[PDB]
RNA sequence: AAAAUGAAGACAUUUUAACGAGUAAGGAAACGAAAUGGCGUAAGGACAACAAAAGUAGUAAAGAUUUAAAGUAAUUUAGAU
RNA sequence: AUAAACAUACUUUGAAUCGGCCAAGUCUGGUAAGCAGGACUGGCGAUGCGGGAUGAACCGAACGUCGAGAUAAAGUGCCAAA
RNA sequence: UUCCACCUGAAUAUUCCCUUAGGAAGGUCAAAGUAUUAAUAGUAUUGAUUGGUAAAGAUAAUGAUUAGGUGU
RNA sequence: UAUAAGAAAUUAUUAAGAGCAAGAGAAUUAUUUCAUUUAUAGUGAUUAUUAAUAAACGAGGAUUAGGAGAAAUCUUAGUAAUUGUGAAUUAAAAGUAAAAAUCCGAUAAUAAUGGAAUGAUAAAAGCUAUUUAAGGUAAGAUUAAUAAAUUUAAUCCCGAGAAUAGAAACUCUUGAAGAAGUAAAUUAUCUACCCGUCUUGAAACACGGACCAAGGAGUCUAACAUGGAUGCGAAUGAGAAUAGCAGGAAAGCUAUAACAUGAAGAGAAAACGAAAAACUAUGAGAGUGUAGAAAUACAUUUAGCAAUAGUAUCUUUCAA
């Protein structure tokens, strides 16, 4: 009955499916990543409580990179972080009256 | 419940031939069929006027037909009522279709060279109505209408049903 | 505002308009409340107003087009189910936690349970 | 209420839609698409096995007591005594 | 602006009725009255149903015969469904 | 003050009566019958108005009423 | 009469046999809905990686005698100014900034799995497969320029319409040893004040009613009016008395007829007694053409009845 009333249902259902299928895969291909960054910060923890933990000076860079990006994108990460810091300061000042 | 302004009551329109007249029943059958199929407003009009009560179908005399047919020489006057005769004035040549013709009215129309038709012949000849003139008689000429209302009224008094010591 | 105690109202979303029209929609054809079943009947009733399909009908209602009055007047009033009217009761304004009055966009939660 | 069909089917046709509370009170009969529909009491005029012996009845009428069936209801129908 | 064609305008003939009663973000006489009398609206009378234990008027809501669900007033220790 | 079902469904204003336990005109209601119909509105908006209630005033007019200065 | 349909009966085999009704399922479904699970373009908080400054806060601070913990290797214990925690802020590493869990906001929708009430059985504007390609507006994917973007370009993918081919006929239980339904009696849960009447209000401590049968109350004659069916129609009636006919008849048929109502109205009465062969407005109906395109919607020509309202004109009256 929906097709009889709205023939556009077939166009926005197949195309809706392809949105769903890929969007589900993005969850998977963000969990594999967040498995590395979660299994690269374990071997920066059980390697830091273990020996060093006074001898509180522990190495600053026990966390290791897992996804590689070009130098230009590295500059954009610090550009983005500056913007979101400004946005947080922009909002906090506003609601603080 | 539901807030309706008024509830459903029968619509006060007649849709069949009043009484047990076998021929008037067939005429309503014929024109209810003609109006439904041809979808002509003429058959719708004739069918509606066939279903009125006798008081609401007033007569039309030959004098009135003559005056209304003056500038309609080759036409067929159609009045759904009895056609009486006006002996005061002459009857010219014309074709009339009516439910019933007075004995004198039929002779006067015929003797002048005209024709007296019935409604079945009219439907056979002019079903949708092409050379016809629709005519109805006067309703306010009834004497009963004189006594309706208040006779003490300042504007349009009634006419005082006569009775004991009426001066 | 004058009839505030007897009605609750608000601003619908597009999805709310679609569900009401598709599920509870109807038209007044020849004085008969005929439910919407095809685009042919919508074309017959509202073809003169350049509304020939149900999605034209939804778009006109939502955006309030030029022919909103003719389109809206052809649509029979929807008959809804029952749902939890209010927190305390329907004898106080929704602002006080009651049932009637202007709910603004929060009317879509109520319509979800009533459609 | 509106469409469709309509000499005879029949269940007072077919379809779609809206509706159905109620004291006093009103809606007489007839009216094919019927301007409400029906039950009962008694009497009068007809009709009742269509092929020249034409409704039922001493092979058990009316009535009475009950058992069941049809009808929303008024009531009707049938069995047994 | 919104609504309105089973809309609108009626015409004719006629029935019953003019003892009323209650509520109140109302008023007058009275110390006051389940007193007497009024303005506006809604009800009871003419009215059943769910709730207030019970009740003409209170609250929800007005009724063809049924099935399934979401509800309203209002409730969830037992009588009593939660 | 005697059968069933179905549909619609009220009243306590106004005028007159030797009227006050009752009548007639009229309002409410029902049933019949019409008219293609200058013949829709117990609603809101915009525009021009009407009114003298709630409030307000009290050497602002008519009244009521407690005092304190200055001058003759 | 020509073609399928091709019935009953017959032949061989067994996965070997009714009708109806009730119940339970099967496969695909229509309307409504119950329970559970699952994603909902929060840029919200936590979810061990290191360091520093802190606004505040209490304590502590410098040989094992008795012990706690752990198989640690490290902490705990108590008998004259070093140090501990820390809201918040900052640096480096990591991070394209969508995992999972909880909280906080937003929502409740698509789907799936099980049912319930009323149904249906049929094949598709079903669903599936092959062809070309309208489309994918953050978001179908991969890339590049850049970027607090629902900003751009490329080529890969899928793909609506349409054309062409595909698929649904089932199982079990109970019943003339009595099924389903219905009825009567009893039991059990819920439920139920005395009918009629006057009355604002009665189950009322208001009146009538002990019970049963039969009788029992809007009728008949006469005058007027409205209204629905009927006949005739400037006439209608003349079943006014009464007079005739066949038949023998309280019935039926026939009588150019007095009269009743109406066709003429106003005035107390005398005396009188109606056209400008009318006018204006809106209004019923009938055609032609075009178009949508199914019905229907516009343009234009024509007729203008009924009804209502208003005009002239005429009869009568002191006065219309």
Coordinates of N, CA and C in Angstrom, one line a residue, chain B residues 13-125:
Chain B
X13 N -37.7 16.6 0.7 CA -37.9 16.7 -0.7 C -38.5 15.3 -1.1
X14 N -39.6 15.4 -1.9 CA -40.3 14.3 -2.4 C -39.5 13.7 -3.6
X15 N -39.4 12.4 -3.7 CA -38.6 11.7 -4.8 C -39.4 10.6 -5.4
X16 N -40.7 10.6 -5.4 CA -41.5 9.7 -6.1 C -42.9 10.3 -6.3
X17 N -43.7 9.6 -7.1 CA -45.0 10.1 -7.4 C -46.0 9.9 -6.2
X18 N -46.4 10.9 -5.6 CA -47.3 10.8 -4.5 C -48.6 10.1 -4.9
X19 N -49.1 9.2 -4.0 CA -50.3 8.5 -4.3 C -50.1 7.2 -5.0
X20 N -51.2 6.5 -5.4 CA -51.1 5.2 -6.0 C -51.5 5.2 -7.5
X21 N -51.2 6.3 -8.2 CA -51.5 6.4 -9.6 C -50.5 5.6 -10.4
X22 N -51.0 4.6 -11.1 CA -50.1 3.7 -11.8 C -49.4 4.4 -12.9
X23 N -50.0 5.3 -13.6 CA -49.4 6.0 -14.7 C -48.5 7.1 -14.2
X24 N -48.8 7.8 -13.2 CA -47.8 8.8 -12.6 C -46.6 8.1 -12.1
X25 N -46.8 6.9 -11.6 CA -45.6 6.1 -11.1 C -44.7 5.8 -12.3
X26 N -45.3 5.4 -13.4 CA -44.4 5.1 -14.6 C -43.7 6.3 -15.1
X27 N -44.4 7.5 -15.1 CA -43.8 8.7 -15.6 C -42.6 9.1 -14.7
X28 N -42.7 8.9 -13.4 CA -41.6 9.2 -12.5 C -40.5 8.2 -12.8
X29 N -40.9 6.9 -13.1 CA -39.9 5.9 -13.5 C -39.2 6.3 -14.8
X30 N -40.0 6.8 -15.8 CA -39.4 7.2 -17.0 C -38.4 8.4 -16.9
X31 N -38.8 9.4 -16.1 CA -38.0 10.6 -16.1 C -36.9 10.5 -15.0
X32 N -37.0 9.7 -14.0 CA -35.9 9.3 -13.1 C -34.8 8.6 -13.9
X33 N -35.2 7.8 -14.8 CA -34.3 7.1 -15.7 C -33.7 8.0 -16.7
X34 N -34.5 8.9 -17.3 CA -34.0 9.9 -18.3 C -33.0 10.9 -17.6
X35 N -33.3 11.4 -16.4 CA -32.4 12.3 -15.8 C -31.1 11.7 -15.3
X36 N -31.2 10.4 -14.9 CA -30.0 9.7 -14.4 C -29.0 9.4 -15.6
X37 N -29.6 9.1 -16.7 CA -28.7 8.7 -17.9 C -28.3 9.9 -18.7
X38 N -29.3 10.7 -19.2 CA -29.0 11.8 -20.1 C -28.3 12.9 -19.3
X39 N -28.5 13.0 -17.9 CA -27.9 14.0 -17.1 C -28.3 15.4 -17.6
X40 N -29.6 15.5 -18.0 CA -30.1 16.8 -18.5 C -30.9 17.5 -17.4
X41 N -30.7 18.8 -17.2 CA -31.4 19.5 -16.2 C -32.8 19.7 -16.5
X42 N -33.3 19.5 -17.7 CA -34.7 19.5 -18.1 C -35.4 18.3 -17.5
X43 N -34.8 17.1 -17.7 CA -35.5 15.9 -17.1 C -35.4 15.9 -15.6
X44 N -34.3 16.5 -15.0 CA -34.3 16.7 -13.6 C -35.4 17.6 -13.1
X45 N -35.7 18.7 -13.8 CA -36.7 19.6 -13.5 C -38.1 18.9 -13.6
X46 N -38.4 18.3 -14.7 CA -39.7 17.6 -14.9 C -39.9 16.5 -13.8
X47 N -38.8 15.8 -13.5 CA -39.0 14.7 -12.5 C -39.3 15.3 -11.1
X48 N -38.6 16.4 -10.8 CA -38.9 17.1 -9.5 C -40.3 17.6 -9.4
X49 N -40.8 18.2 -10.5 CA -42.1 18.8 -10.5 C -43.2 17.7 -10.6
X50 N -42.9 16.5 -11.1 CA -43.8 15.4 -11.1 C -44.1 14.9 -9.7
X51 N -43.2 15.1 -8.7 CA -43.3 14.6 -7.4 C -43.8 15.6 -6.4
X52 N -44.3 16.7 -6.8 CA -44.9 17.7 -5.9 C -46.4 17.3 -5.6
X53 N -46.9 17.9 -4.5 CA -48.3 17.6 -4.2 C -49.2 18.4 -5.1
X54 N -50.5 18.0 -5.0 CA -51.5 18.6 -5.9 C -51.6 20.1 -5.8
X55 N -51.6 20.5 -4.5 CA -51.7 21.9 -4.2 C -50.5 22.7 -4.8
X56 N -49.3 22.1 -4.9 CA -48.2 22.8 -5.4 C -48.0 22.7 -6.9
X57 N -48.9 22.1 -7.6 CA -48.9 22.0 -9.0 C -50.1 22.8 -9.6
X58 N -50.1 24.1 -9.5 CA -51.3 24.9 -9.9 C -51.5 24.8 -11.4
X59 N -52.8 25.2 -11.8 CA -53.2 25.1 -13.2 C -52.7 26.3 -14.0
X60 N -52.6 26.1 -15.3 CA -52.3 27.1 -16.2 C -53.3 27.1 -17.3
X61 N -54.0 28.3 -17.5 CA -55.1 28.4 -18.5 C -54.5 28.6 -19.9
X62 N -55.4 28.5 -20.9 CA -55.0 28.7 -22.3 C -54.6 30.1 -22.5
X63 N -55.2 31.1 -21.8 CA -54.8 32.5 -22.0 C -53.3 32.7 -21.6
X64 N -52.9 32.1 -20.5 CA -51.5 32.2 -20.1 C -50.5 31.6 -21.0
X65 N -50.9 30.4 -21.6 CA -50.1 29.7 -22.6 C -50.0 30.6 -23.8
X66 N -51.1 31.2 -24.2 CA -51.0 32.0 -25.4 C -50.1 33.2 -25.3
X67 N -50.1 33.9 -24.1 CA -49.3 35.0 -23.9 C -47.8 34.6 -23.8
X68 N -47.5 33.5 -23.2 CA -46.1 33.1 -23.0 C -45.6 32.5 -24.3
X69 N -46.4 32.0 -25.2 CA -46.0 31.5 -26.5 C -46.0 32.5 -27.6
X70 N -46.3 33.8 -27.3 CA -46.4 34.7 -28.4 C -45.2 34.9 -29.2
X71 N -44.0 35.0 -28.6 CA -42.8 35.1 -29.3 C -42.0 33.8 -29.4
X72 N -42.8 32.7 -29.2 CA -42.2 31.4 -29.4 C -43.1 30.6 -30.3
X73 N -43.2 30.9 -31.6 CA -44.2 30.3 -32.5 C -44.0 28.8 -32.6
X74 N -42.8 28.3 -33.0 CA -42.6 26.9 -33.2 C -41.9 26.3 -31.9
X75 N -42.6 26.2 -30.9 CA -42.2 25.6 -29.6 C -43.3 24.8 -29.0
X76 N -42.9 24.0 -28.0 CA -43.8 23.1 -27.2 C -43.8 23.5 -25.8
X77 N -44.8 24.2 -25.3 CA -45.0 24.6 -23.9 C -45.1 23.4 -23.1
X78 N -44.3 23.3 -22.0 CA -44.3 22.2 -21.1 C -44.6 22.7 -19.7
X79 N -45.8 22.3 -19.2 CA -46.3 22.7 -17.9 C -46.7 21.4 -17.2
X80 N -46.2 21.1 -16.0 CA -46.5 19.8 -15.3 C -47.7 20.2 -14.4
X81 N -48.9 20.2 -15.0 CA -50.1 20.5 -14.3 C -51.2 20.4 -15.2
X82 N -52.5 20.5 -14.7 CA -53.7 20.6 -15.5 C -53.8 21.9 -16.2
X83 N -54.2 21.8 -17.5 CA -54.3 23.0 -18.3 C -55.8 23.3 -18.5
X84 N -56.4 24.3 -17.9 CA -57.8 24.7 -18.0 C -58.0 25.6 -19.2
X85 N -59.2 26.0 -19.4 CA -59.6 26.8 -20.6 C -60.1 28.1 -20.1
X86 N -59.6 29.2 -20.7 CA -60.1 30.6 -20.4 C -61.1 31.0 -21.5
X87 N -62.3 30.8 -21.2 CA -63.4 31.1 -22.2 C -63.5 32.6 -22.5
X88 N -62.8 33.5 -21.8 CA -62.9 34.9 -22.1 C -62.1 35.3 -23.3
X89 N -61.1 34.5 -23.7 CA -60.2 34.9 -24.7 C -59.9 33.8 -25.7
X90 N -59.6 34.1 -26.9 CA -59.3 33.0 -27.9 C -58.0 32.3 -27.7
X91 N -57.9 31.1 -28.3 CA -56.7 30.3 -28.2 C -56.1 30.2 -29.6
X92 N -54.8 30.6 -29.7 CA -54.1 30.5 -30.9 C -53.6 29.1 -31.2
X93 N -52.8 28.9 -32.2 CA -52.2 27.6 -32.6 C -50.9 27.4 -31.8
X94 N -50.8 26.3 -31.0 CA -49.6 26.0 -30.3 C -49.7 24.6 -29.8
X95 N -48.5 24.0 -29.5 CA -48.4 22.7 -29.0 C -48.1 22.7 -27.5
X96 N -48.9 22.0 -26.7 CA -48.8 22.0 -25.3 C -48.6 20.6 -24.8
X97 N -47.7 20.4 -23.8 CA -47.5 19.1 -23.1 C -47.8 19.3 -21.7
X98 N -48.8 18.5 -21.2 CA -49.3 18.7 -19.8 C -49.8 17.4 -19.3
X99 N -49.9 17.3 -18.0 CA -50.4 16.1 -17.3 C -51.8 15.8 -17.7
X100 N -52.7 16.8 -17.8 CA -54.1 16.5 -18.1 C -54.7 17.8 -18.7
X101 N -55.6 17.6 -19.7 CA -56.2 18.7 -20.4 C -57.7 18.6 -20.1
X102 N -58.3 19.8 -19.7 CA -59.7 19.9 -19.5 C -60.4 19.6 -20.8
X103 N -61.6 19.0 -20.8 CA -62.4 18.7 -22.0 C -62.5 19.8 -22.9
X104 N -62.8 21.0 -22.4 CA -62.9 22.2 -23.2 C -61.6 22.8 -23.6
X105 N -60.6 22.7 -22.8 CA -59.2 23.1 -23.2 C -58.7 22.3 -24.3
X106 N -58.8 21.0 -24.3 CA -58.3 20.1 -25.3 C -59.0 20.5 -26.7
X107 N -60.3 20.7 -26.6 CA -61.0 21.0 -27.9 C -60.6 22.4 -28.4
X108 N -60.4 23.4 -27.5 CA -60.0 24.7 -27.9 C -58.6 24.7 -28.6
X109 N -57.7 24.0 -27.9 CA -56.3 23.9 -28.5 C -56.3 23.1 -29.8
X110 N -57.1 22.0 -29.9 CA -57.1 21.2 -31.1 C -57.8 22.0 -32.2
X111 N -59.0 22.6 -31.9 CA -59.8 23.3 -33.0 C -59.0 24.5 -33.6
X112 N -58.0 25.0 -32.9 CA -57.2 26.1 -33.4 C -56.1 25.6 -34.3
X113 N -55.9 24.3 -34.4 CA -54.8 23.8 -35.2 C -53.6 23.3 -34.4
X114 N -53.7 23.5 -33.0 CA -52.5 23.1 -32.2 C -52.6 21.6 -31.9
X115 N -51.8 21.2 -30.9 CA -51.6 19.8 -30.5 C -51.6 19.7 -29.0
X116 N -52.2 18.6 -28.5 CA -52.2 18.3 -27.0 C -51.4 17.1 -26.8
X117 N -50.2 17.2 -26.2 CA -49.3 16.1 -26.0 C -49.4 15.7 -24.5
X118 N -48.9 14.5 -24.3 CA -48.6 13.9 -23.0 C -47.1 13.9 -22.7
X119 N -46.7 13.6 -21.5 CA -45.3 13.7 -21.2 C -44.5 12.5 -21.7
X120 N -45.2 11.4 -22.0 CA -44.5 10.2 -22.6 C -44.1 10.6 -24.0
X121 N -45.0 11.2 -24.8 CA -44.7 11.6 -26.2 C -43.6 12.7 -26.2
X122 N -43.6 13.6 -25.2 CA -42.6 14.6 -25.2 C -41.2 14.0 -25.0
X123 N -41.1 13.1 -24.1 CA -39.8 12.4 -23.9 C -39.4 11.6 -25.1
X124 N -40.3 11.0 -25.8 CA -40.0 10.3 -27.1 C -39.5 11.3 -28.2
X125 N -40.2 12.5 -28.2 CA -39.8 13.5 -29.3 C -38.7 14.4 -28.8

